[PDB]
Amino acid sequence: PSLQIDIPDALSERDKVKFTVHTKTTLSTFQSPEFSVTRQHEDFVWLHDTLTETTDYAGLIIPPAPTKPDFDGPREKMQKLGEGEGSMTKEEFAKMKQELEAEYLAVFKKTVSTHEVFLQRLSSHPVLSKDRNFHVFLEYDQDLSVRRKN
Amino acid sequence: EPTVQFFKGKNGSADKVILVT
């Protein structure tokens, strides 16, 4: 209960999916008792691969990386839904928009779950929860793009 | 072009998505 993480919300923008990573901790090894950051799916992938390529960690039961969420389908339907707004009736536009939202909702619930469980499993691991890069993932305010390139 | 925003449901509320304008 010293390190608790959750994902209260998520966002699909273009081809990127952003997760809000919310952390409540009693550990003074973190600068703040409560904080939130924004992380893309790529950051989760980077976190996992960084742990596995740490030679000291080789052998540890490392939880599997969350798989890439698939929004290609819904994104296509949504935009093509959008073009036909003028042409489309004002009665079925909300019909299959609500059906589109439901399609997004199904994908979101699943991928948020996989991403959250991944982080929660890392928090309960006696070795991995103290990792420097895991710390950065949870606490570092700015975008991880540059630290993923160096 | 637009973005879709997801919100986890709290206090028994249902999770939902919002098509952002």
Author numbering:
A (entry chain A): 29 to 178
B (entry chain P): 111 to 131
Original paper wording:
Likely bacterial candidates include the inclusion membrane proteins (Incs), a group of proteins that are unique to Chlamydiales and that are translocated from the bacteria through the Type III secretion system (T3SS) and inserted into the inclusion membrane. Retromer is composed of two distinct sub-complexes of tightly assembled subunits: a cargo recognition trimer (VPS26/29/35) and a membrane deforming heterodimer made up of sorting nexin (SNX) SNX1 or SNX2 paired with either SNX5 or SNX6. The individual SNX1/2/5/6 proteins encode a Phox-homology (PX) domain that recognizes and binds to specific phosphoinositides on membranes and a Bin-amphiphysin-Rvs (BAR) domain that both senses and induces membrane curvature. We recently discovered that C. trachomatis IncE binds directly to the PX domains of SNX5/6 but not SNX1/2 and that IncE is sufficient to disrupt retromer-dependent trafficking of CI-MPR.
To uncover the molecular basis for the strong interaction between IncE and SNX5 and to illuminate the biological function of this interaction, we determined the crystal structure of the Mus musculus SNX5-PX domain (SNX5-PX20-180) bound to the C-terminal 25 amino acids of IncE (IncE108-132). The structure contained four copies of the SNX5-PX:IncE complex in the asymmetric unit, which are all less than 0.41 Å RMSD between the molecules and do not appear different in conformation. SNX5-PX20-180 is a mixed α-β structure with three antiparallel β-sheets running along the surface of a long α-helix (α3) stabilized by two shorter helices. Outside of this β-sheet formation, the structure of SNX5 complexed with IncE108-132 is notable for its almost complete lack of hydrogen bonding or ionic charge-charge interactions, relying instead on the formation of a small hydrophobic core at the interface of the two proteins. The changes between the apo-SNX5-PX structure and the IncE108-132 bound SNX5-PX20-180 structure are small and consist mainly of an inward rotation of the SNX5 α-helical hairpin ~30° toward the IncE peptide.
